[PDB]
Design an enzyme around this catalytic site. Structure first.
Site, PDB file in Angstrom:
ATOM      1  N   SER A 233       0.870  -1.130   0.481  1.00 39.77           N
ATOM      2  CA  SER A 233       0.090   0.371  -0.081  1.00 39.77           C
ATOM      3  C   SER A 233       0.582   0.999   0.097  1.00 39.77           C
ATOM      4  CB  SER A 233      -1.025   0.162   1.312  1.00 39.77           C
ATOM      5  OG  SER A 233      -0.149  -0.151   2.266  1.00 39.77           O
TER       6      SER A 233
ATOM      7  N   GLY B 285       2.865   1.409   8.901  1.00 36.68           N
ATOM      8  CA  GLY B 285       2.771   2.735   9.064  1.00 36.68           C
ATOM      9  C   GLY B 285       4.108   2.313   7.430  1.00 36.68           C
ATOM     10  N   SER B 286       2.945   2.029   6.391  1.00 40.79           N
ATOM     11  CA  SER B 286       3.653   2.091   5.005  1.00 40.79           C
ATOM     12  C   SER B 286       3.931   3.307   4.503  1.00 40.79           C
ATOM     13  CB  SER B 286       3.903   1.197   4.019  1.00 40.79           C
ATOM     14  OG  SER B 286       2.212   1.138   3.607  1.00 40.79           O
ATOM     15  N   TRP B 287       2.357   4.527   4.325  1.00 47.09           N
ATOM     16  CA  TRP B 287       2.366   5.476   4.586  1.00 47.09           C
ATOM     17  C   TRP B 287       3.224   6.830   5.104  1.00 47.09           C
ATOM     18  CZ3 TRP B 287      -3.369   7.667   2.965  1.00 47.09           C
ATOM     19  CH2 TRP B 287      -3.885   6.414   1.361  1.00 47.09           C
TER      20      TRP B 287
ATOM     21  N   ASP C 272      -2.404   4.956  15.114  1.00 46.40           N
ATOM     22  CA  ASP C 272      -3.482   3.479  15.193  1.00 46.40           C
ATOM     23  C   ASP C 272      -3.443   3.094  16.725  1.00 46.40           C
ATOM     24  OD1 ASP C 272      -3.870   0.565  14.675  1.00 46.40           O
ATOM     25  OD2 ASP C 272      -3.692   1.500  12.956  1.00 46.40           O
TER      26      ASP C 272
ATOM     27  N   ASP D  90      -6.845   6.132  20.411  1.00 45.95           N
ATOM     28  CA  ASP D  90      -7.678   6.379  19.331  1.00 45.95           C
ATOM     29  C   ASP D  90      -8.513   7.350  19.215  1.00 45.95           C
ATOM     30  OD1 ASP D  90     -10.412   6.423  18.907  1.00 45.95           O
ATOM     31  OD2 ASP D  90     -10.715   4.199  20.004  1.00 45.95           O
TER      32      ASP D  90
ATOM     33  N   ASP E  39      -5.771   5.195   5.630  1.00 48.51           N
ATOM     34  CA  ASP E  39      -5.087   4.061   4.614  1.00 48.51           C
ATOM     35  C   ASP E  39      -5.962   2.771   5.217  1.00 48.51           C
ATOM     36  OD1 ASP E  39      -5.355   2.651   2.254  1.00 48.51           O
ATOM     37  OD2 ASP E  39      -3.203   2.118   2.992  1.00 48.51           O
TER      38      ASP E  39
ATOM     39  N   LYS F 217      -9.145   6.679   2.529  1.00 48.15           N
ATOM     40  CA  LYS F 217      -9.306   5.135   1.743  1.00 48.15           C
ATOM     41  C   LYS F 217     -10.839   4.880   1.568  1.00 48.15           C
ATOM     42  CE  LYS F 217      -7.669   1.417   1.867  1.00 48.15           C
ATOM     43  NZ  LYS F 217      -7.934  -0.288   2.254  1.00 48.15           N
TER      44      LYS F 217
END
Lengths: 231, 998
Positions: A17, A47-49, A75, A91, A116, A156
């Site tokens: 992603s 955490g890729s974004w 997250d 949260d 995302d 998304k």
């Protein structure tokens, strides 16, 4: 298990992603701005974004536009740390995670907030689409505040039967609402991205945004304009 | 447009006094379940599916789904086609709904764990909720124990099950322990227990008084979607994404309060999920509703209902009744079932009889000749046992119906055979049967004996020469011939009237080895059709014709899994199969794709036998030093109330076009058609033109991955494609009375990458055709399919650029053969390949003419036209050429939810110009997935992922939207249209299938 899953392992990105936000930025270029300074990545795990945010705004940016730049990624699941990213396990509903995010900025509002996040689809399309617009709504809670007026919000979406509600529910709050598949987005997916540019004016166990957007909107549908993103 | 039929996700089911009520898309279906008759279909909701329903004692139906809710009368649902005006929309998703104890209010549970108490017009009276943080729910039920004792049982996303008291708004329990989101919660009727399930794949039993976990159950192999208590709260039934329904025992003890114990597993739906379940405690029957649109009835007592379903005997059990007569290392080596029970023989030639009536075994006689590896055969219908050995000895015995007395006996030795290794038997006619015996010496004969059914004497003996690679494995007779199944997929046909005639040898029918059964199906004119199964899973239907004989393969397929030991047709014309998957015997309805019965045999399963009995079958087998008898009774209720379709996306649909040919008259009231799915299968079936009712015939399983395209290219040929370069040419046969047949004719050569689309142009009357395929890597290939050599010849190859190419189409205009592609850059790109292929174009409706030159691989010329149309990938491509074939209008539906109309024209000098005529930027809310031109290009039907079917009109090259209609078919991605003779039938595919009329 496609192209992007090996190209992710080849460049050290946590998930395939990562290219959706890159192929997104090949257009809109909201991350190619040298003035860009504060960003929030919500529902960021794994955490890729956030990596893309780190690489674009530090590893590949002149030292002259690295000042006061601050990336906070949130997250409820704990995340492995990322260079130049402050990872909060909190949260997006809860009380001081809006104040907390704001403290890690100079109580400056964020220039750009992205998300995302998506739950695992069940195969029940009406449920999957409703759950997704749940997560976008509650995400919109904090983006409503922390985002600088005139600033980008990216999320998304499940581009299905009721998407035209979400667009019109979002008409009140943005200059130009766009909808984008990139090209790392699987054809097998109802996936797309709602790239809201120009944050316009917000308003002025209880009532939440879902019910007051449902309050005003209601049972009406608009079509957001469409934008392919990559090269 | 009018909606006619729907097969698709069926989210809930309820038993109600000899009815089953099923939420079925946006409808309620009411069935009389003992006869499986659909009494009525009533649409409750405009577009939402029915997620849940329940009935008051007095016949009111409460139904909900997503944000929709309604209260409706069972009387009306029985006779009205639609009741959508009673539908109401609540602001939040509705997780559950139940009637109040006295049925004067309803209680609605929202996804945020608030309960709306409403009147019977669904108007809110007040709301109950807890204090504290909001909870997001993936499940819940409201359980009414008494007038003021109402429990709200909430299954949260975070994995807690919240049990709270409705009227006091008081938390009773927060059950923690699950690892994922809670996808179903239920309570036992006696107030003792909670059961919850998650996507952690566990079921958890909780004590409702104490709030403690008592038991965790792990059986299901995927996410669990639904569960409930039944049989006075002593059992639990759960239903899963793994397509199984599982029954659990609640075992109560002093030292541990209660524990779940897995009891039975039933695989009852197609891939993938099962959503609804309910149990009729009376009859111990369950009903399940699936994503595949199937409604399944399950006998929860398949092994206990009549009390004689399972029986086993060790050799000691038997010796206690026959006496201590068995020698060391002596065991049962053969057995047959007759009217009275079992006849068996030991490794030392002891012949034993087991009586089904008295349950007693007894030694019948000993024949020491058959202590040398005895083989057992039989004519069950006539109580005849056939014993053979490896020394060319035969023993035949006939038994009386009830008495089981030996009434005839005959014995002989075949001098023509030195050592014997296989004996087969088959019925012949009213007075005799056939017996074949074979040896491993290549120059000894294959011996066929005709033997009297009355006194077991030999009527005639026939000796045939064996072909080279031949070992007999099964036998059938037909007229005066014998069809002998052999190894290597060989079938040898001998003539009983002339043992010097050369046999008719059919070689290599399938990739498999041993032929396991040959079964006559039907005949017409001078042709007979036979079913031929292969141990390795393949089955073929062959057509034998008397002209001298010739044969044609009409049908081929492979079982999904395991060994295929035989197949037959039942009285309803359905193909029933049996075999093994590793340890497990199966009996499987291959026409409608569900299991009838299963049994764990002895892994090796060296010795087993199946026989037909009145009201079922008996399966006999040896397992773990025991002789087992399993009786498989015909279902007490029908197997299904709906058979169902695919349980995954339907990516393409094709109707077999109307013909001047000899299509059988039983198909006159409808059409044969195909659906091609992401589940990797092609399903061939039929729909009635007036009722839209769908019947299944076959599920073709050749493809390894999910289907992309399938299209009937004419009345008897069909092409399908998938990925990894799967492209198959299929031939359909629809000449016979009960079902069509389909077989592979050839596969496309392969160079991973996918075949995204294809198109074909026929070569005049040849039955040869040209094929264009486009691939994920932008390559383009043109092929010549030669009928007589049954081969694909590559005659052109090239590449567009680097991006995927999603559609391709042949357009013949004037004397030019054009190729039109739609790359993901959103262009229309045209190639004129006329000068570079050895074919000519007839000036009107565009027929190819073969020049009959040799195959060179031409390179793809540079495009003659490149028109940008859409902003992204083009999902649908269609065209219509004008009356003079000088121009064609091209309709494109885009991933940009735009709809484009372009003109492709050639002038008097044959130069190509591609001009776009109109473009509707917001033609749909999401991806346009289909766009077909109808009525000579005057109108358009589109399909899109927003589940809105749109009809358009074209006037002067300009599009205007003229009608729209929603469908429940989610992710709507396929469309097929046929004219009636004008009025149209539309087939709509996605997750589900709908049939409409226009």
């Amino acid at each position: 298990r496609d192209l992007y899953y090996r190209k992710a392992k080849e460049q050290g990105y946590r998930a395939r992603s990562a290219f959706k936000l890159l192929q997104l930025n090949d257009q809109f270029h909201f991350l190619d701005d040298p003035n860009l300074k504060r960003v929030v990545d919500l529902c960021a795990a794994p955490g890729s974004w956030s990596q893309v945010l780190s690489r674009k705004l530090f590893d590949e940016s002149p030292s002259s536009d690295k000042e006061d730049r601050k990336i906070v990624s949130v997250d409820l699941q704990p995340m492995s740390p990322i260079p130049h990213v402050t990872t909060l396990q909190a949260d997006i509903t809860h009380p001081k995670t809006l104040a907390r995010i704001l403290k890690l900025f100079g109580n400056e509002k964020a220039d750009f907030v992205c998300s995302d996040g998506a739950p695992d689809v069940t195969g029940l399309h009406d449920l999957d689409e409703y759950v997704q617009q749940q997560l976008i709504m509650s995400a919109l809670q904090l983006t409503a505040c922390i985002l600088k007026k005139g600033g980008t919000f990216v999320a998304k979406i499940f581009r299905g039967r009721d998407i035209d509600m979400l667009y019109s529910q979002l008409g009140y709050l943005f200059d130009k609402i766009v909808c984008a598949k990139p090209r790392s987005s699987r054809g097998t997916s109802l996936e797309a991205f709602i790239v809201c540019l120009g944050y316009n004016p917000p308003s002025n166990n209880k009532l939440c945004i879902s019910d007051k957007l449902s309050h005003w909107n209601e049972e009406e549908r608009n079509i957001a304009e469409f934008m392919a993103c990559g090269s | 447009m009018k909606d006619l039929s729907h097969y698709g996700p069926a989210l809930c089911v309820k038993f109600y006094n000899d009815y089953v009520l099923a939420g079925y898309g946006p409808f309620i279906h009411v069935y009389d379940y003992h006869s499986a008759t659909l009494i009525n279909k009533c649409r409750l909701f405009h577009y939402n599916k029915v997620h849940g329903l329940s009935l008051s004692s007095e016949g009111k139906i409460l139904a909900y789904g997503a944000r929709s809710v309604t209260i409706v009368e069972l009387e009306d649902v029985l006779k009205k086609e639609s009741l959508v005006d009673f539908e109401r929309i609540n602001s939040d998703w509705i997780t559950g709904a139940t009637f109040s104890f006295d049925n004067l209010q309803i209680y609605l549970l929202t996804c945020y764990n608030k309960v709306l108490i409403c009147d019977l017009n669904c108007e809110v009276l007040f709301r109950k909720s807890l204090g504290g943080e909001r909870s997001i729910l993936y499940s819940g039920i409201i359980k009414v124990f008494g007038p003021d004792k109402v429990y709200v049982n909430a299954g949260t996303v975070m994995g807690g099950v919240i049990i709270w008291d409705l009227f006091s708004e008081t938390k009773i329990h927060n059950l923690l322990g699950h690892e994922g989101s809670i996808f179903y919660v239920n309570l036992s009727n006696n107030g003792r227990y909670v059961a919850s399930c998650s996507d952690d794949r566990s079921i958890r039993l909780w004590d409702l008084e104490t709030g403690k976990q008592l038991s965790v159950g792990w059986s299901h192999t995927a996410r669990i979607w639904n569960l409930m208590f039944f049989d006075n709260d002593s059992k639990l039934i759960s239903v899963s994404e793994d397509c199984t329904c599982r029954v659990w025992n609640i075992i109560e003890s002093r030292e541990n309060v209660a524990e779940l114990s897995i009891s039975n597993v039933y695989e009852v739906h197609l891939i993938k999920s099962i959503w609804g379940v309910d149990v009729k405690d009376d009859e111990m029957i369950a009903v399940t509703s699936g994503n595949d649109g199937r409604l399944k009835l399950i006998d929860l007592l398949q092994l206990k209902r009549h009390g004689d379903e399972e029986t086993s005997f060790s050799l000691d059990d038997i010796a206690k009744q026959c006496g201590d007569i068995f020698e060391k290392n002596e065991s049962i080596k053969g057995f047959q079932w007759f009217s009275f029970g079992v006849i068996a023989i030991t490794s030392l030639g002891k012949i034993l009889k087991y009586s089904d009536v008295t349950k007693q075994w007894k030694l019948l006689l000993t024949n020491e000749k058959f202590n040398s590896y005895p083989i057992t055969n039989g004519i069950q219908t006539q109580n005849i046992a056939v014993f053979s050995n490896n020394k060319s000895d035969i023993l035949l015995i006939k038994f009386s119906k009830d008495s089981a007395d030996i009434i005839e006996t005959e014995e002989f030795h075949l001098d023509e055979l030195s050592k014997t290794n296989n004996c087969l038997v088959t019925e012949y006619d009213d007075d005799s049967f056939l017996l074949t015996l074979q040896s491993p010496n290549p120059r000894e004969k294959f011996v066929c004996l005709e033997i009297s059914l009355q006194n077991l004497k030999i009527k005639s003996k026939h000796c045939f020469n064996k072909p080279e690679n031949f070992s007999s494995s099964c036998l059938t007779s037909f007229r005066n011939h014998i069809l002998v199944g052999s190894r290597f997929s060989t079938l040898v046909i001998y003539n009983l009237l002339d043992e010097s005639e050369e046999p008719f040898i059919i070689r290599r029918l399938s990739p498999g080895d041993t032929t396991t059964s040959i079964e006559f199906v039907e005949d017409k004119d001078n042709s007979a059709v036979f079913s031929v199964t292969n141990r390795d899973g393949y089955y073929v239907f062959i057509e034998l014709t008397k002209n001298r004989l010739s044969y044609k393969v009409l049908h081929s397929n492979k079982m999904m899994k395991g060994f295929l030991e035989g197949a037959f047709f039942n009285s309803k014309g359905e193909y029933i199969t049996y075999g093994f998957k590793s340890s497990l015997f199966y009996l499987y309805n291959e026409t409608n794709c569900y299991e009838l019965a299963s049994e764990v045999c002895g892994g090796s399963h060296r010795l087993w036998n199946l026989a037909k009995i009145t009201d079922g079958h008996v399966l006999m087998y040896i397992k773990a030093s025991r002789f087992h008898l399993r009786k498989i009774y015909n279902s007490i209720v029908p197997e299904t109330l709906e058979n169902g379709v695919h349980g995954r996306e339907i990516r393409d649909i094709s109707i077999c076009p109307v013909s001047n040919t000899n299509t059988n008259d039983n198909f006159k009231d409808g059409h044969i058609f195909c659906t091609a799915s992401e589940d990797t299968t092609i399903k061939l079936g039929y729909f009635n033109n007036r009722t839209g009712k769908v019947q299944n015939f076959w599920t073709q399983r050749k493809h390894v991955s999910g289907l992309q395209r399938c299209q009937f290219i004419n009345h008897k040929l069909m092409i399908s494609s998938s990925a990894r370069e799967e492209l198959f040419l299929w031939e359909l046969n629809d000449k016979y009375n009960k079902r069509p047949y389909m077989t592979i004719r050839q596969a496309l050569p392969v160079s991973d990458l996918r075949i995204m689309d294809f198109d074909v142009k026929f070569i005049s009357q040849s039955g040869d055709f040209l094929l264009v395929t486009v691939y994920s890597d932008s390559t383009i290939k043109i092929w010549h399919y030669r009928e007589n050599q049954n081969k694909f010849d590559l005659i052109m190859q090239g590449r567009y650029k680097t991006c995927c190419l999603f559609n391709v189409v042949f357009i013949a205009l004037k004397e030019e053969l054009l190729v039109v592609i739609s790359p993901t850059d959103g262009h229309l790109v045209v190639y004129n390949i006329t000068e570079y292929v050895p074919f000519s174009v007839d000036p009107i409706s565009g027929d190819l003419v073969d020049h009959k030159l040799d195959a060179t691989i031409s390179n793809l010329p540079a495009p003659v036209a490149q028109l940008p149309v859409h902003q992204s990938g083009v999902k649908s491509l269609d065209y219509v050429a004008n009356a003079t074939r000088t121009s064609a209008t091209i309709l494109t539906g885009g991933d940009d939810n735009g709809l484009g109309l372009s003109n492709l024209k050639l002038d008097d000098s044959n130069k190509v110009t591609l001009k776009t005529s109109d473009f509707i930027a917001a033609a749909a809310s999401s991806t346009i997935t289909s766009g077909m031109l109808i009525n000579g290009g005057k109108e358009v039907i589109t399909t899109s992922v927003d589940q809105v079917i749109r009809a358009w009109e074209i006037t002067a090259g300009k599009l205007s939207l003229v009608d729209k209609k929603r469908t429940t078919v989610a992710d709507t991605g396929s469309l097929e249209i046929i004219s009636n003779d004008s009025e149209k039938t539309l087939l709509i595919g996605g997750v589900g299938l709908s049939i409409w009329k226009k």
